[PDB]
Amino acid sequence: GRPEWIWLALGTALMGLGTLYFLVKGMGVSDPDAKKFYAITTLVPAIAFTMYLSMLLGYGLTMVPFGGEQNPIYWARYADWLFTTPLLLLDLALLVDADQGTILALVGADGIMIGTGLVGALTKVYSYRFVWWAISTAAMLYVLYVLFFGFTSKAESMRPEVASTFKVLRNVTVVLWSAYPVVWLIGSEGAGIVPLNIETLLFMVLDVSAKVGFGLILLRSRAIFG
């Protein structure tokens, strides 16, 4: 009965409720273009719900020795993020009619981000954990650069309503995503300053905002309609 369980429980509830709501709304829509955004966006909190639930029930946690101690590491987070982060990026790419090659590069970079983050999280030599963290953060910054510079450029060719919706979601994404490496650095996976219970809270707030919040903004907009 780990003290972070309460945030895993609340996370499970919020992702579950978000999923159900998006599913109800999405099943009701008949516009083909809107249905695509609903499918992608409903899947995001659906995956997160399954991983939060698994963690709540005591799975996706392993002990990694570093710094002379046995450290608890929630590896299930990375299984969630491996699939949900590219899905969020795909929502943004569809909104701005991004090029196929841009999408492949973004999804590639995002995979490197999550994959190297996981390797870092599991690494037994303390200093090397941070090498992997740095690589992961570089991949993240590539993603954010492309969203901020590249996608905004593409968005300029869309109707103002679509461009406006994209900018809100872009802004939400940059603010929330940029916090993740800092939480990792100061938390259980990194410097061990912020205790696991508080870190779980922080990741829960970030995750729910980045998936359910993002989804609410996108799915209530006229931008998703063809």
Binding marks (x or -) toward ligand RET, 33..72, rule CB under 6 A?
----------------------------------------
Q: What's the rounded Cα separation, in Å, for the pair 26 and 30?
A: 8
Residues that bind ligand CPS (CB under 6 A): 1, 5, 56-58
Closest CA to 123 of 180, 66, 204, 74: 66
> For residues 70, 72, 73 and 76, what is the CA-based torsion angle, rounded to 10 degrees?
140
Binding marks (x or -) toward ligand RET, 119..158, rule CB under 6 A?
--------------x--xx--x------------------
Please say whether the dihedral angle defined by the alpha carbons of residues 100, 39, 175 and 110, taken in this order, is positive or negative: negative
- Binds ligand RET by CB under 6 A, chosen from 73, 169, 207, 213: 207
Stretch that binds ligand RET, among 147-155, 179-187, 191-199, 216-224 (CB under 6 A): 179-187
To ligand CPS, the closest distance from the beta carbon of 140 in angstroms equals 31
Identify each DSSP E strand in the chain by its residue range.
61-66, 69-74
